[PDB]
Amino acid sequence: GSHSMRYFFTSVSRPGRGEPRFIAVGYVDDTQFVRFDSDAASQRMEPRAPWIEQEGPEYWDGETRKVKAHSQTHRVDLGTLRGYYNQSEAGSHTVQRMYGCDVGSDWRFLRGYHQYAYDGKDYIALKEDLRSWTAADMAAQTTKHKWEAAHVAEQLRAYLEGTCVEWLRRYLENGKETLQRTDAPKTHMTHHAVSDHEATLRCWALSFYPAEITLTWQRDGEDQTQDTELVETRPAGDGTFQKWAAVVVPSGQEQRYTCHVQHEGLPKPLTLRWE
């Protein structure tokens, strides 16, 4: 299948409370493998997956050096963005940056991306072509013009099409046991009385990987999407994921309902019926 590597950077100004908080995390597909936290003791990029722990001193020294460079850039960004929007000095603000790349089944470059946000809102984004920019507003225009002149896009395209996919492939190899696995969901249904004339039917999908999954309820084959409570897919904490969907069924109509499960790890979609 295809794969992705993505880095997430968050920077939060804390006026009169020291330098801004900076947090960086890296993911291959749905698996985290590194992190940096400016409030942590080490002041180094750190491993968050077993398959990356033995990468070696050169790798860790290099990522630590670069992630500090990122941290410092974002430290200046916060002042700059306050200066573009003429905002008060006492308020806390947030910058967010995400970049990464995807490879196909062949492990060929598929796409690259670079997105930037200020206070929870799109600010500037690299377009699909990796040659131009999309500015969210007027302030973002200043940046757009500045990066267009600094040929920053060319630099990113080089990274995304080169270093990014080269190392994604290396990680996929290194953690081929963790990353190149699919864990099919273990499923079951539960039944709980709501009254004397109603019951909650809950369809569970547990311990699956990757996170992508589809859980749907049907009554006589008709999608009950509007009457389904569906929680967000959530981490179990062990690298696997969980999800459930529930419907309230009039007591006695259980046999009309089926839960349908689709996951990459399954040979064919599952259809669960209470009976």
């Binding site: 880095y7 960086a24 890296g26 790798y59 290099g62 990522e63 670069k66 992630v67 460079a69 990122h70 850039t73 200046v76 960004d77 700059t80 963005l81 970049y99 930037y116 600010y123 500037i124 940046t143 500045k146 990066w147 600094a150 920053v152 630099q155 990113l156 990274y159 270093t163 990014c164 190392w167």
Partner: peptide, 9 residues
């Protein structure tokens, strides 16, 4: 692996 060098907005 991360990018280098990053550019200010």
């Amino acid at each position: 692996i991360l990018k280098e060098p990053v550019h200010g907005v």
